[PDB]
Amino acid sequence: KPFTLPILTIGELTNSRFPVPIDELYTSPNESLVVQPQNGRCALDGELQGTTQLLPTAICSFRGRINQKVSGENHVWNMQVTNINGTPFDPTEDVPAPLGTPDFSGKLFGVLSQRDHDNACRSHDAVIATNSAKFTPKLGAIQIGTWEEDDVHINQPTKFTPVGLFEDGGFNQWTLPNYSGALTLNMGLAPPVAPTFPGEQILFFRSHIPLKGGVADPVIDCLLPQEWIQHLYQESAPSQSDVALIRFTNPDTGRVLFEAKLHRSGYITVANTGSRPIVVPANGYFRFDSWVNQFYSLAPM
C-alpha cells in the first residue's frame, strides 16, 4: 500500500496543537529547546501518540462537571474532567492525560458553557492555567477561573471552548504541563524530537493564536498538521524506511520549491541554518517522493 500525503494547501491545513488554521511554515535552530509536543503526534503508519486524537475542534477543549467552588476563592472553580465525548477518563489509560489536553504551559482563555439536566444554559469567559499546581488533568481534575463567581452551576454538564491565550507572560509552547501536578513526573509521553543530521532543522506548521490582552505575537508550532494525522490514521500504510522524502511542489508551475525529510516518528526536517518564515505559494503542497535513509543529504533551502 503506497504511502501518500493528502493534497492540501497551506490554506487548507489545521494546527494539530490548537484548533485554528495553519498560517505559515517556520524553521529555526533547536538550540537548548526540548521540543516534545503531545498533541499533533503520529507515526507515519498512523499510530497516534501522546495526547493526540482525531477531532481538530476538540484540541485544547475540556469536558466534565464543576464539583465545587474553590474554597476561599472568588471566581475560581474545580472541574472533574471527562474525555471529549463525555466518557469517564481512566487515569490508568497509558497516556499523559486525556486526549486533547493542552500540551503547553500558560493561561488558556476561552468560554465555559453548561447545559443543566433541565436544559438551563449559561456561557461565561474562563481561564485555565496549565502551569498551575491545580492543573492535574491526569488525575481527572483541573481548575477554572471566571470573572464572575455567581453564575456557574455545580454538577451540571460543562464544556470549555478554547479561544486563545489569556496573557503572554509565562507562555512557553514547549514547556509541558505537569499533567499529574507538583513533584510528579509525566508518563506515556511521545518522545522529544530534534534534528540529528548535520545542517538540518525541524520544519514547523505555525499558527498565530488569539490573545486576550497585552502586546505580543504568541505562536503555536505543530510537527504535522491535523489533516496529515487524520490521513495517516486512515491509511495505516507501513513505513518502508525511517524517512520519507517529500517535496513541496507548486502544482501550477510544477516547480519543486524545496525538499524535506518526513521522519517515521512523525516530524519533518529540512536543510536550513537560520530561523526564517518560509514563504510558499498558496497553491503549493508537499508530495511524497520516495523512501530514503536517515542519512540522505537534502538540498539546502
Ligand X SMILES: C[C@@H]1O[C@@H](O[C@@H]2[C@@H](O[C@H]3O[C@H](CO)[C@H](O)[C@H](O)[C@H]3O)[C@@H](O)[C@@H](CO)O[C@H]2O)[C@@H](O)[C@H](O)[C@@H]1O
Q: Would you say 183 or 282 has its CB closer to a copy of itself?
A: 282
* Binding-site partner at residue 11 among a copy of itself, ligand X, none, CB < 5 to 8 Å by type: a copy of itself
Work out whether 227 is an interface residue with a copy of itself (CB under 8 A): yes
- The runs of H, that is alpha helices, within 23-90 are none
Which has the closest alpha carbon to 172: 34, 20, 27? 34
Binds a copy of itself by CB under 8 A, chosen from 34, 133, 187, 216: 216
For residue 106, what is its C-alpha cell? Answer: 500558560
Amino acid found at 295 = F
| Cα angle: 243, vertex 204, 295; to 5 degrees | 25
Name the grid cell of 180: 499529574
Kindly state the smallest distance separating residue 216's Cβ from ligand X, in Å: 9
Q: Which cell is 142 given? A: 483541573
Tell me, rounded to whole angstroms, the distance of Cα 271 from its chain centroid.
Answer: 24
Residue 19 contacts a copy of itself per CB under 8 A: yes
For a copy of itself (CB under 8 A), the number of binding residues is 46
Contact stretch for a copy of itself (CB under 8 A) within 196-204, 223-231, 255-263, 265-273: 223-231
Q: Does 88 bind a copy of itself (CB under 8 A)?
A: no
Q: Whole-number minimum distance, CB 27 to ligand X, in Å?
A: 29
Q: How far is the CB of 245 from a copy of itself (least distance, A)?
A: 21
CB-based contacts of 38, cutoff 8 Å, min separation 6: 49, 50, 51, 52, 96, 97, 101, 103, 176, 189, 190
- The sign of the torsion formed by the CA atoms of 151, 57, 189, 166 equals negative
Would you tell me which residues interact with ligand X (CB under 6 A)? Answer: 120-123, 151, 212-215
Q: Which chain residues interact with a copy of itself by CB under 8 A?
A: 6-8, 11-12, 14, 19-21, 54-58, 84-85, 109-111, 113, 115, 118-123, 125, 159, 161, 163-164, 208, 210-217, 227, 230-231, 234, 282
